[PDB]
């Protein structure tokens, strides 16, 4: 379809990991979503919330609608569960790597299904719990999902990083190595 | 593998030449079974799983009428409202040159994805030995691109990387040696 820009409402419900998600994207960039369990509209950029507003209950309502559509489809589909699709993982920095210049390490998980994922950062072989951030289970046009994971760090020659991704489509956790 | 079933839907607005096209998809485990198309005017089953859902939806006239008003009630409304913050969002790129024998022109942090990066050596545009990556989405509403250039270093040679972007009125150039 010929289009200059594409604005899309995306939402899913499932049995595990996040039982629901309701977001709105503009040119494949998530603009805002509705935080289920907190039930308020969370904007990706702070400047978005100052210029727009969204009735967060529209997502909670649509999630409830998709909930019964799931149960209805579960019955008609003869309880069929889809095939687990393994993900592709890539790690790259946000800014040019310079020693002593704070940067953000981006771990991109792509082309997986279902949206059930364990992602964790490792620096020099031990868990990193602080300075970490993650994106939503972003949708793709081919009905699979991709996701972002961020880690703020100071580039050092001694440190080597790993983005460990765990998914049902994998036999073992996937270690994606990265170093300067 | 644990027991897990998923249901997802899409509400897509397609803007082009001042028009709006709405498509509403109904998906169960990556299988799109039901779809409403604004250019079609009514629901139609995409697979055998969605025939009873599409037939029931086409009988309810209010459902068919509500969806036909979406390209003007929602698609046109959000497209005009998000104009300044999304359509006309301009973030200027940052250009860096490093030798890592190749030369890396690292363009970071820019939103309008359409960008072109050319390599010049002593005023001559280089085409052979140019390796550029794809567009790299950061998720921060920002993009990246890295253009490599295989060079035969000569003393006195001036390698320049120019960048032309919609967020720039004049091209930005960075030189090496």
């Amino acid at each position: 379809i010929k289009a200059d820009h594409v604005s899309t409402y995306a939402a899913f419900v499932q049995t595990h990991r996040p039982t629901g998600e309701f977001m709105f994207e503009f040119d494949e960039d998530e603009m805002f979503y509705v935080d289920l369990d907190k039930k308020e509209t969370v904007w990706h950029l702070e400047e978005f919330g100052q210029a727009f507003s969204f009735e967060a209950q529209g997502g909670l309502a649509n999630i409830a609608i998709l909930n019964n559509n799931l149960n209805t489809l579960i019955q008609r589909s003869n309880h069929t569960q889809a095939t687990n699709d393994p993900p592709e993982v890539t790690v790259f920095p946000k800014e040019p790597v310079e020693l002593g210049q704070p940067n953000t390490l981006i771990c991109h998980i792509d082309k997986f299904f279902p949206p059930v994922l364990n992602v964790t950062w490792l620096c020099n072989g031990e868990l990193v719990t602080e300075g970490v951030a993650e994106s939503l289970f972003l949708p793709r046009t081919d009905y699979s999902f991709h996701k972002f994971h961020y880690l703020t760090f100071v580039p050092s020659a001694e440190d080597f990083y790993d983005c460990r991704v765990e998914h049902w489509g994998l036999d073992q956790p996937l270690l994606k190595h990265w170093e300067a | 593998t644990p027991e897990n079933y998923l249901f997802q839907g899409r509400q897509e607005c397609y803007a082009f030449n001042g028009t709006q096209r709405f498509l509403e998809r109904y998906i169960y485990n990556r299988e799109e079974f039901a779809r409403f198309d604004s250019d079609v005017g009514e629901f139609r089953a995409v697979t055998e799983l969605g025939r009873p859902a599409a037939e029931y939806w086409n009988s309810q006239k209010d459902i068919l009428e509500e969806k036909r008003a979406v390209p003007d009630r929602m698609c046109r409304h959000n497209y005009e409202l998000g104009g300044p913050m999304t359509l006309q969002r301009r973030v200027q790129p940052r250009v860096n040159v490093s030798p890592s024998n190749l030369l890396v022109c690292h363009v970071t942090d820019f939103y309008p994805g359409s960008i072109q990066v050319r390599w010049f050596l002593n005023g001559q545009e280089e085409t052979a030995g140019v390796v550029s990556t794809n567009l790299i989405r950061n998720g921060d509403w920002t993009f990246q691109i890295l253009v490599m250039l295989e060079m035969t270093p000569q003393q006195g040679d001036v390698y320049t990387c120019q960048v032309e972007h919609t967020s720039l009125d004049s091209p930005v150039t960075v030189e090496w040696k």
Binding site: F52, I65, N69 | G9, P52, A53, K67
Partner: peptide
Amino acid sequence: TGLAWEWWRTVY
């Protein structure tokens, strides 16, 4: 101002 939204319909 405010952004618009739409109801997904219910299945048979």
